């Protein structure tokens, strides 16, 4: 049989600020590559193999030969400078414990959960609209709306007080803040923990439906431990502000795109549809996140991954996968089932995705319907986006409308 080279050189993936909602070229790179490929991350050390394929994807992200709790002892190559998760978060959790912890909440974030809080989240959104269209027309749509209403959403649903959703925001956004963009981001998560370990303990240690109270519940009941708690709200927390990040390429996309603004204004029964492609279109994040290790030798496409090696997945290439989506760079609000992975896979998948739907769908609705004519105020190339950031989305979305 002839030699050949089945492992791929290492290929360095620097941080690299993309504009818009661009895709990364590196990742693209990587993708024609080949299924199974190296990264080499601006931080941690060593490399790291990366699966780009829908179904490479699943099973990485769905099989027990895998695991979280082992990222913490080494330092994997990574993007951000530090960890996100806290030692026992459900991100560095593995199914034993890992299934425990999201069992606690699992009823507060199902379609049925979600929906529970969607007449009273129109309220609040209907609230901040009427504030930016009040004020007058120049205005910053994050600012006014796609920050406050995500936040405002996810403290009210955490049982945190609207006197310290402030607080929320900027620890999260130092924790996300490209996490390189400083290294305050340790001192925000203890922040943060210190936080909501106050929070569950204190008063929610009885009654209530909000999460922290659930979570005291739970604490008090011997189920889960105050640290697994605690790890876990964070990440809710946090997570919370994701759809600021998304909801704001969602934004910049329909007024970039005439076309797709203009069918989703006058059809807004198809919006659920439409939001779910364009959660899949859109380019969610920098990079990949946080990988998992091998806890035994696996063969993926011919590639055989060793114990111990770490292995990363691109839940964006997945989405991009020409053998799953079709013509995968083009937006059809229309796509067949379209089984997209952007709220991840496997036991570790996006609690919030239903939240996160639910927001985005309640924001389409009163930014279209509710604000006569809205604009970007500037040349779609002029929006700046976070520069230095892990979630990507517009730093400020510049906007103007009819009224003045
Ligand atoms: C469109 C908005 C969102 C997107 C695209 C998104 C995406 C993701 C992705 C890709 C993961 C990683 C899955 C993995 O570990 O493989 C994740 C995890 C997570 N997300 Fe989200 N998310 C969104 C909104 C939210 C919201 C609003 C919340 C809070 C209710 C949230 C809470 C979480 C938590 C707690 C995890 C960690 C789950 C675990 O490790 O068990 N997410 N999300
Ligand atoms: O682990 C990841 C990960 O690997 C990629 C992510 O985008 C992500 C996220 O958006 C939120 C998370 O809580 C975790 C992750
Ligand atoms: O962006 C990341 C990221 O790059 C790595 C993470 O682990 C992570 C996380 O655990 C939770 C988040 O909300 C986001 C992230």
Redesign the pocket.
């Known amino acids: 049989e002839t030699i050949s080279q089945a492992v791929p050189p290492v290929r360095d993936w620097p941080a690299v600020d993309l504009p818009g909602s661009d895709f990364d070229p590196v990742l693209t790179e990587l993708m024609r590559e080949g299924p199974v490929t190296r990264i080499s991350l601006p931080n941690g050390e060593g490399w790291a193999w990366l699966v780009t394929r829908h179904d490479d994807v699943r099973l990485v ?1 769905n099989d027990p030969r895998f695991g979280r709790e082992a990222v913490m002892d080494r330092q994997v190559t990574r993007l951000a400078p530090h960890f996100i998760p806290a030692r026992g978060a ?2 560095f ?1 593995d199914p034993p414990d ?1 299934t425990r912890l ?1 069992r606690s909440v699992a009823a507060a ?1 199902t379609a049925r959960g979600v929906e529970r809080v969607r007449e009273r989240s129109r309220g609040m959104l209907d609230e901040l609209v009427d504030a930016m269209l009040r004020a007058g027309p120049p205005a910053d749509l994050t600012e006014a709306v796609l920050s406050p209403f ?1 936040i405002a959403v ?1 403290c009210e ?1 955490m049982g945190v007080p609207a006197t310290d959703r402030h607080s929320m925001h900027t620890w999260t956004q130092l924790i996300l803040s490209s996490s390189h963009g400083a290294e305050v981001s340790e001192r925000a998560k203890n922040e943060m923990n210190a936080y909501f370990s106050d929070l569950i303990g204190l008063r929610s240690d009885s009654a209530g439906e909000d999460v922290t109270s659930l979570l005291g519940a739970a604490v008090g009941r011997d189920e889960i431990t105050l640290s697994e708690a605690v790890g ?1 709200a964070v ?2 927390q946090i ?2 502000e ?2 600021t990040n ?1 909801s704001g390429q969602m934004f910049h996309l329909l007024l970039s795109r005439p076309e797709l603004a203009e069918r989703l204004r006058s059809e807004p029964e198809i919006r659920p549809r439409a939001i779910d492609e364009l ?1 899949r279109w859109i380019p ?2 920098n990079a990949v ?2 990988s998992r290790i091998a806890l035994e030798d696996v063969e993926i496409k011919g590639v055989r991954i060793r114990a111990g090696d770490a292995v990363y ?1 691109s ?1 964006l290439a997945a989405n991009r996968d020409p053998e799953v989506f079709p013509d995968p760079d083009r937006i059809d609000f229309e796509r067949s089932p379209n089984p997209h992975v ?12 239903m ?2 739907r639910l ?2 769908e309640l924001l389409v609705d009163a930014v279209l319907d509710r604000v006569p004519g809205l604009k970007l105020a500037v040349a779609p190339e002029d929006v700046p986006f976070k520069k230095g950031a892990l979630i990507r989305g517009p730093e400020a979305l510049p906007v103007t409308w009819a009224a003045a």
């Open positions: 992200t459900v991100g959790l890992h999201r974030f995500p996810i649903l876990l990440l809710l997570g919370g994701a759809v998304n959660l969610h994040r996140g946080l997945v839940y952007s709220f991840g896979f496997g036991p570790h998948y996006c609690p919030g995705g939240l996160a927001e985005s």
